[PDB]
Design a protein around this ligand. Structure first.
Ligand SMILES: Nc1ncnc2c1ncn2[C@@H]1O[C@H](COP(=O)(O)OP(=O)(O)OP(=O)(O)O)[C@@H](O)[C@H]1O
Ligand SMILES: Nc1ncnc2c1ncn2[C@@H]1O[C@H](COP(=O)(O)OP(=O)(O)OP(=O)(O)O)[C@@H](O)[C@H]1O
Ligand SMILES: [Mg+2]
Ligand SMILES: [Mg+2]
Ligand SMILES: [Zn+2]
Ligand SMILES: [Zn+2]
Lengths: 113, 320, 320, 113
């Protein structure tokens, strides 16, 4: 994990250094849910623009991650499913960790029955 | 002996109202006509949970046959049943439990978006057949096993204005949720199974291999998802309280997701997403305007669907 | 066709290990001998969840017969089954699902603490019969419907050192928990069903009337409690991880309680209470020292039990 | 409910007035779980002594409440089942609400199967 490899100080720091330098971007750490059965890449660090919607941020994730369009996914943000039509900024305003970053988890969507 | 049996089951239901929840409405539940899209593990458990609740009219929709490995996981079929068609065996099965049940089995194939149309007329009949079934029932339970099989039913059900309870399993988790319904008086509509991603449901089985994904799940998920699914329906059926999102049977969540590794359960809520390839206003308009003509297009061209709902206008925006 | 069927079910289990959890141990589960004290709603669901997991040896212990209202809530019995003895019908029922199951039905009556002994010799035989059954199996599931019926099984199981998974339902909730086992090397022992109150289990049925309490529950609780109960057993059966209370299948809670009105689930833990009228050291000593002689006394004099465990020395202390 | 009939001020007050006057007692509010099927009495206010165990506090509840010995109950303390052999004080030290009182819920124990 990201937090499991960096303390509050070093994490609360790169957060402000990112806010001070790019007041238009949003510090997001995106990684796959623990027990989910889908693809993942070393790029856990993302600095998306505030005007970009969750949907748009989701496209990036599955794109960058090389996920096929036949399989869907959902994302958690503090055990919550953010509206797909919400601005990544408004989300950051409500779910940002005290360390400056917005933690996001993605997992394969359930389809069996 | 049928009378005395009927009376016995009936009394058990009456006792929970009379002695525990006098405000409880059992009649609404009893009379509810239920349509089960899927007669597999979820379909079997949900159906067992519904007769226990007093529901009398249940219809199974499934086009498969009882496989050798089905019995141990699909609680309505036995080993001797192998090879026989599911929907019907399933309805027969409920009757062996409660003979007065009005169980029916329709061997219907749900046209899947993303797959090539093999027989236009034949699959146009399938289409109308499904809509009629959704039209006559009150609650539709989407208990199929693929993302694609959920699209058409989600839409028709939205059009006919029926309540939909969607349940889907993962290896370690499960999702149970009720789709929103479009209300003229309320500018508030809850999301549907499809409002969570930005891809148009498409063929995911034809190209599938063990490499892609195994379909096995932990036995527990099926049982849980089913019971929660039925308890959601029975609560949702109760008049809610004036100043709250609760009823005599408690809350009425929009979305419920569970996980076995950490024995948890989350309640959630997601508003209708305007670019949903299923509940988006643009998609509803297209259906109201062109019926089977438009659906045939979405069915064979998932990307088309995206062009219609706007999922392209937003990826195209990010693309620049 | 039995071979091809066996292979089919087997492959489904193997796939979850091979493609998802390679560290998973299916053999331990398969070979586990399970004793089900109770063949009612919980007993039926737990048993269905266990064959799905691959368990082959399951024994039902129940002394009742199929009632008219049982079918709709007890998923192993049909309407035609009414009047017939449960334990056996139940084992026959599992076989109709998977013929290779080693299902057995023992029509045994569990002597209930608080009730008068009606036939010493007869109920002494019952006693030994139960201990033998607990002795031969590996996991005992306490799925009975009264506080009293849980006492003897809790104790014998503690004495024989078997793992016990206890499940009990309420109208709106459910409790699923594993009793602790006394380890010489570990000064840490988890509590049992009885470590939560300070009264000795006693006759609660003879004096019971509708005024006291109705036995009906919301259908959902049974299904949930069962699946969680089996998923607990399958996890608990996995070697836990070096620095944690987790395994390949996740956590291994001590106690799980759920509620339907607010779709919740809590994990909890309670240490063995020294004045427990069931797992208290003083009670174990008395049993090891006097066997059936001591039990006969507790059986007819619940208050005696309290005198033995110390539940009196503490109420007497507060009394002053 | 007790909190539903009194604000943080009036509640954070009687708490200190109780601590100042009886530094040996423990301010406990005991009421039946919302959806539980068992007896309850208007006496929701209890000032038990710190040396008294949870078990002993439980005896009081079922006694004062007039509950038969055939039916059992369990108690919650911030969605937790306190060891029966714990001192009501040690419990207060760990679950007391910022309002000075230790909130306790009791409910009928589950026995069906
Ligand atoms: N397009 C469809 N039309 C009608 N029924 C369908 C359709 N797609 C799936 N089903 C039914 O949905 C049910 C899903 O049950 P389930 O997936 O649990 O078991 P299964 O599909 O039979 O095989 P398996 O146990 O390996 O999953 C099946 O009975 C299947 O026949
Ligand atoms: N002392 C006992 N010895 C053996 N079996 C028992 C004993 N006590 C209870 N049982 C069995 O435990 C099971 C509990 O199942 P359950 O309570 O769900 O249904 P029921 O007791 O048959 O009647 P109901 O559906 O109204 O509860 C019953 O099948 C019952 O016969
Ligand atoms: Mg399938
Ligand atoms: Mg009973
Ligand atoms: Zn939608
Ligand atoms: Zn104990």
């Amino acid at each position: 994990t990201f937090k499991s490899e960096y303390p509050f100080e070093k994490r609360k720091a790169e957060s402000e250094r990112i806010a001070d330098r790019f007041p238009n971007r949003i510090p997001v750490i995106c990684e796959k849910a623990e027990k989910s059965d889908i693809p993942e890449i070393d790029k856990r660090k993302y600095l998306v623009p505030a005007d970009l919607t969750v949907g748009q941020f989701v496209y990036v994730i599955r794109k960058r991650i090389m996920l096929p369009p036949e399989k869907a996914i959902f994302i958690f943000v503090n055990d919550t499913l953010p509206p797909t039509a919400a601005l990544m900024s408004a989300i950051y305003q409500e779910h940002k960790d005290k360390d400056g970053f917005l933690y996001v988890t993605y997992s394969g969507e359930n389809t069996f029955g | 002996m049928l009378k005395i049996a009927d009376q016995s089951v009936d009394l058990n239901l009456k006792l929970m109202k009379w002695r525990i929840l006098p405000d409880l409405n059992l009649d609404i539940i009893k009379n509810t006509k239920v349509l089960l899209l899927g007669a597999g593990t979820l379909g079997c458990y949900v159906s067992r949970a519904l007769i226990a609740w007093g529901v009398r009219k249940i219809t199974f929709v499934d086009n498969g046959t009882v496989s050798y490995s089905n019995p141990v996981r699909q609680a309505l079929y036995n080993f001797e049943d192998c090879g026989k068609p599911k929907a019907e065996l399933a309805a027969a099965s409920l009757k062996r439990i409660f003979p007065l049940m009005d169980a029916t089995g329709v061997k219907l194939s749900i046209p899947m978006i993303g797959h090539k149309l093999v027989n236009e007329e034949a699959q146009h009949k399938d289409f109308d057949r499904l809509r009629a079934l959704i039209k006559e029932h009150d609650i539709i339970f989407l208990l199929v096993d693929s993302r694609e099989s959920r699209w058409l039913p989600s839409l028709l059900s939205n059009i006919e204005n029926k309540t939909v309870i969607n349940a889907a399993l993962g290896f370690d988790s499960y999702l149970v949720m009720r789709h929103g319904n479009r209300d003229e008086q309320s500018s508030k509509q809850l999301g549907c199974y499809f409002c969570h991603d930005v891809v148009a449901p498409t063929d995911s089985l034809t190209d599938r291999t063990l490499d892609q994904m195994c379909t096995v799940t932990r036995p527990g998920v099926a049982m849980m998802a089913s019971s929660l699914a039925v308890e959601l329906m029975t609560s949702l059926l109760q008049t809610k309280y004036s100043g709250s999102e609760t009823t005599v049977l408690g809350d009425i969540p929009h979305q419920i997701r569970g996980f076995l590794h950490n024995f948890s359960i989350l309640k959630l809520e997601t508003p209708a997403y305007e670019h949903c390839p299923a509940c988006s206003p643009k998609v509803i308009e297209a259906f109201t305007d062109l019926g089977w003509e438009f659906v045939k297009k979405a069915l064979e061209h998932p990307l088309y669907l995206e062009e219609i709902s706007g999922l392209s206008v937003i990826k195209q925006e990010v693309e620049r």
